[PDB]
Structure 1
């Protein structure tokens, strides 16, 4: 997760190390989200911090509105291509990785989301869920 989130989040498999680029699912004007940090992440020598579903990450926009680039911003992960296993026994996975831009609290910068959203994420950030189409 991150913080400013409502609730807890049973561990899901990590899909996105630092340096990963994922799609941006909102109307914000950004095409990419480039992962440079993960708000959960503890410490191990040589270990890459890596996010999963519903994690707040620090990002930059590598492509999109110039007024949105060259600066680091919070981001929330709504889809991952990396397989993970819900407690109900089912291994699942999306078609892409995507995040939505957000502020340190959780409030999305934009007000829309294209594509489906993992419920773990949606159940963790109200505003993401508020602005979400199909969930899961």
Structure 2
């Protein structure tokens, strides 16, 4: 559902992913219809064009995709349960949405795990 937008373009979310990316730099949010001055903003479950800013050089200087799997910006469940994370990290992923890592680090959000069938499986936990 609605997930209050957390990670505007320019954000540097961490890479939770198995890969050698250390952190992602959000470049733009896929599916972002734009109002005028508004910055595109990734939120939980969103695919994101992101360049690794730190980590293995092979990943370092190309735009990459990444779904956001956790988020310090808290959001409200339809269940009425506002919730949030210690950190907001994403995982690198294909345009298809298959994830390129072999295993996600920390907890993955419930609506990361539900949009992304593969992300859900590698997730150590769902939240």
TM range (shorter): over 0.9
Aligned residues: 127
Matches within 5 A, 1:1-136: 10-136=1-127
Q: CA deviation at 1:81?
A: 0.1
Q: Distance in 1 between matches of 2:7 and 2:120?
A: 21
What RMSD in Å do the two structures reach over aligned CA positions?
0.6
Q: Distance in 1 between matches of 2:18 and 2:111?
A: 22
Unaligned runs of 5+ in 1: 1-9
Q: Tell me the TM-score normalised to structure 1 length.
A: 0.91
Q: CA deviation at 1:74?
A: 0.8
Q: Distance in 1 between matches of 2:58 and 2:30?
A: 25
Q: CA deviation at 1:43?
A: 1.5
SS in 2 for 1:127: helix
SS in 2 for 1:37: strand
Q: Distance in 2 between matches of 1:43 and 1:100?
A: 24
